[PDB]
Structure 1
C-alpha cells in the first residue's frame, strides 16, 4: 500500500463512526486503491467501511445510453459489495449538500474519495470541504502512477511524458491485495424515473425508432473482464497492425468500462504485460492505455482551462489566429453536425457510428473532430461543438481522454506543427483521400448508413 497514491484534501478531527468512501470515478469493487485504502483506515480505527455514491443533477446533460450503462453497473456493484459485508448508499442530489449531510447523519469518522481532475469534481470537492469537520483524503485509483507523482507540470508531448512514466512503473505497477470484508432508494426506481425524464431527448431515427443499439457493450465489472480477456486472446496480436482500420473490430473496446471505472487500467496492464504476443502490438497498446490515457489526466490536472482555446500551445494559438478570417469551405450548424448532414460521407458515417453504438472508432474520431474545426466559424466554436457531441453521445465521454483528445485534434495539444494550410493553419490535417489510402472507406460508410 504505497502512500504516494493518497493525498489529504482537508485535515480535521477524526470522528468515531465509519469510514466513508465517496465513490465517483472508480465504480468497481476489485482492483480499487481508493476502496482498499478506505478499508485499511477503517481497520486501523476499528470501524466499518461504507460506500456512498451520489446520483447528481447533471445526468440530464447526457442521455439514456450513459445513464443505463452506469446504473446497471452499480446494480451489480451493490451485490458485489454486500457479499463483502460493505453497505452501499445511493444519494440523489448535489454532492455538496448530500455528502455533507450523510457524514453528519452517520457520524462518519473519515471521508475518502477517488481522483478525477475534471472541473465538476473540483466543484463538488469545494462544496464538501466547506460542509465537513472530519479528515478528507483522495486516492488516485484510476492511473497506474498517481497523477501528481508522474509529473509536476503539464507535459507538452508524449515523448517528454513517456520516460517519466516508464521510470516509475517498477514502483507503481504491482498486484492488488484482496479486499477484506468488514468484520436512499432502490436503484431500479432511480433508473426508471431518470429514464422517464430523459425520454423526450432520446436520439431517434425519423421512423421514431431509437438510434442507440445497447447490445454492443454489456455494462458491469463482470462484462468488462470478459472484454479484457477476449482482447488479449483474440485481438492483441493484431492490434499493432489494425488499430487504425475502422472496418475491423480490433480495438480493445475497453474505454466505456475504463471511463466509469468498471475495470482498472492497472489490471489491464498487468495482464497484457504477462501475455506473450507480438512485441510491437504490446508496445502500441501499452502506449495508448498508459501514456495517452495518463497524459490526458496530466493535461486536465495542470490546465484549468483544458476545454478552452487558452490551453492550446502558443504555436497553435498563433497559427489558428492567423487563419481566423480565412473563408471556410463550408459552415455547418450544431444540428447539421449532430444529424450527420455534411457533404462528407465519411464524416457522416463516423457520426452515425457514434449515434448508433456510442463508441466511434479511434481513428475516425481524429478525422471527425478535425473536420469540425475546418467547417466551423472559429476554433472556439469548433471546440464547443466537438465537446457537446462527444459528451452527449460517447459512452466514454465526459472524460479527461475526451478533452485531451479533442484538444489534440483541434488545437495540436501533444502534437507538433505541420505544413501550413488555409483555415486550419499548422494543425495536423487529415484528408478524405488520405483515409482512402489507409483503409476501405466504402466499407465503413456502407456499414453506417
Structure 2
C-alpha cells in the first residue's frame, strides 16, 4: 500500500516517512533505488560507495527484524522509472520519502512527485535531516540570512523547539514480497574490494553503530569539546559525520540529548562542559547552514560556487596533485593528514582546513581537483557540507577565510597539534624531530635535523613549494585576477 523510499536516511528511529507509513494502517514496502547516473558529477565516490554497501545490508536486517520481507533494492539510471515500476510491480497506493536539500535532489525529486502523481500515486515528503526547514528560518524582512552567525542565532531563538525524535514502528507489515525481486547492487570494483575492506579497521557503518558513537561521545569527550575541539592529536570530536551524512542518526535526537546533558551539567556547576554543548550544537548548526545555503542561494550559472575565483590563474600541475594525494608535500601537518585521509576515509575538520588551504594557497591548484579527490576518499562526503567547506577555505563566503593570506604552518601546528603528536603518529619518520621544528622541518639547522635522523630530500621530502614563493605567486595571481576583474 505504501512505499518507503530510502536515500540518505538509513535509520529506523525518527524517520518520519517510515513511521507514518507504518501508522497509516496498511502495508509498508521499504525500498532503496541506486540511481547514481542521476547525480552527474556528484556521483558517489569510491569509499562512500563502500559505506552504503554495508549500511544497506545493516539496515536490511534492522528492517527484517521489525516484520519485513526485505529492503527492495532497485537499479536504474532514472529514479522515477525504477520507483514507478516498483509502485506497479509491488502495486502500491502511496510513495513516502524524506526530502533532501542538495541542488540535484531538489529538482529531481519534484520531477518524481509529478511523474508519480500522473500515474495516480499519492506522494508525501517529510523532514529527516534538519532541526528546522530552510524556509522556516528567516530574518526580520522575511529574507534568507547570508552569514552563519545571524542564521544560527535565529534557530537558537526559534519560537518552537526542534521536533522530538519519533519512535520507530512497533513493527512494519510488508505483505508477501516473495514475488517482488531485488536487484543485486554493485558498489565496488572487484579490483578495489580488498583495499576497501580495510576501511573497517576504523569504521563500522550502520544505524546501530551511529547510536553507539553518539552515547560514546556524549559520555566521553563532549565535556571537553569547548577546549579540545580544535586538536587533532586526540579523539576530541564525535566521529559522527559519516553516520550523519547517510542519516543513520537523528540530528533531532542529538540536539535533544545534548540539551539534556547541558541542563544537568549546568545544575552541577560544570560551566566548561555547559559551554561544550553550546559549541557542539553550533557544529550541528553548521550542518544546518550547509543545507540552508544550498536551498536559498544555490549554485547558478549567473554566479557559480567559487565565483570570486573566476579569473584566478590556477597552477595546473598534475605532478603537484600527485604529491599532495600521497602526502609527500614536505609539510608535515599536511602530509600527516593526507596519509590519514587515505588510510581511514576521515579527517578532523581542522586538518581538512589545513590540507585544503594548502591545496589552494601554496600549490594553488584548481580547487575543483581537490574537491573531486575529497569526494572519492571521504566516508562522509556530503554535497552541501563539502561545498560549504571549500567555500569557507577559499573565501567565497563573507563569513569565510581571508583570500590574500597564507597560514604559517606553526600557527596551524600550535592550534591543532601543539605537541606534534598528530604528525608523529602518521609520519613515524619524524618521531625524533623536536616539537619546535616538527611542523616546518626546512627551517631546522642541519645539526638538529641530523640529531633527528632526518635528511630533507631522502628520509622525508623537501618543501615542494616554499612559503615565500607561494606568497609571492599568490599576490601575482590575485593582482592578475583583480586587473582582469575590473576589465569586465
Q: What TM-score, normalized to structure 2?
A: 0.73
Q: Residues 247-266 of structure 1: matches in 2 within 5 Å?
A: 247-266=233-252
Partner of residue 3 from structure 2, selected from 20, 43, 57? 20
Q: Whose Rg is larger?
A: 2
Q: Does 1:162 align with 2:152?
A: yes
| Structure 2: runs of 5+ lacking an equivalent | 174-179, 266-272, 428-488
Report the secondary structure of 2:221's partner residue: helix
Corresponding residue of 2:299: 305
Cα 1:162–1:177 change in 2 (3 A) is: same
Q: Does 1:69 align with 2:54?
A: no
Q: 2 CA distance for matches of 1:100 and 1:35?
A: 18
Q: 2 CA distance for matches of 1:376 and 1:307?
A: 27
Partner of residue 347 from structure 1, selected from 317, 324, 334? 334
Cα 1:311–1:168 change in 2 (3 A) is: same
- C-alpha displacement of 1:333: 4.2
Partner of residue 433 from structure 1, selected from 375, 392, 410? 410
Partner of residue 103 from structure 2, selected from 110, 114, 119? 119
Partner of residue 285 from structure 1, selected from 274, 280, 289? 280
- C-alpha displacement of 1:353: 1.1
- C-alpha displacement of 1:280: 1.3
Corresponding residue of 1:232: 218
Report the secondary structure of 1:85's partner residue: coil
Report the aligned-residue RMSD. Answer: 3.1
Corresponding residue of 1:139: 126
CA contact (8 A) 2:226 2:276 kept: yes
Q: Residues 179-198 of structure 1: matches in 2 within 5 Å?
A: 179-182=169-172, 190=185, 193-195=186-188, 198=189
Corresponding residue of 1:366: 353
Corresponding residue of 2:474: none
Corresponding residue of 1:54: 33
Residue correspondences, number: 400
Deviations 1:380-437 (CA, angstroms, capped at 9, x unpaired):
x21x12321211111000332121112111234261574xxxxx42xx7433121133
CA contact (8 A) 1:39 1:48 kept: yes
Deviations 1:110-147 (CA, angstroms, capped at 9, x unpaired):
22221222233245425534532222222120111123
| Structure 1: runs of 5+ lacking an equivalent | 1-17, 419-423
Q: Does 1:34 align with 2:14?
A: no
Deviations 1:7-56 (CA, angstroms, capped at 9, x unpaired):
xxxxxxxxxxx11121111111112122223334x33xxx2222110123
Partner of residue 393 from structure 1, selected from 377, 383, 401? 377
Corresponding residue of 1:12: none
Q: 2 CA distance for matches of 1:304 and 1:288?
A: 22
Deviations 1:329-377 (CA, angstroms, capped at 9, x unpaired):
9986433322223232221211111110111011111111112211455
Cα 1:142–1:321 change in 2 (3 A) is: closer
Cα 1:135–1:127 change in 2 (3 A) is: same
Report the secondary structure of 2:258's partner residue: helix
Cα 1:311–1:21 change in 2 (3 A) is: same
Identify which range, 329-338 or 162-171, moves more after superposition.
329-338
Q: Does 1:273 align with 2:262?
A: no
Q: 2 CA distance for matches of 1:251 and 1:166?
A: 22
Report the secondary structure of 1:160's partner residue: helix
Q: What TM-score, normalized to structure 1?
A: 0.79
Q: 2 CA distance for matches of 1:70 and 1:122?
A: 21
- C-alpha displacement of 1:328: 6.9
Deviations 1:41-82 (CA, angstroms, capped at 9, x unpaired):
x33xxx222211012345995555333322222222222223
Corresponding residue of 1:200: 191
Q: 1 CA distance for matches of 2:83 and 2:163?
A: 32
Q: 1 CA distance for matches of 2:425 and 2:302?
A: 34
- C-alpha displacement of 1:441: 6.3
Corresponding residue of 1:93: 76
CA contact (8 A) 2:3 2:29 kept: yes
Cα 1:330–1:61 change in 2 (3 A) is: closer
Q: 1 CA distance for matches of 2:410 and 2:302?
A: 30
Q: 1 CA distance for matches of 2:112 and 2:62?
A: 27
Cα 1:311–1:182 change in 2 (3 A) is: same
- C-alpha displacement of 1:264: 0.8
Cα 1:414–1:106 change in 2 (3 A) is: farther
Q: 1 CA distance for matches of 2:52 and 2:316?
A: 40
Q: 2 CA distance for matches of 1:148 and 1:36?
A: 24
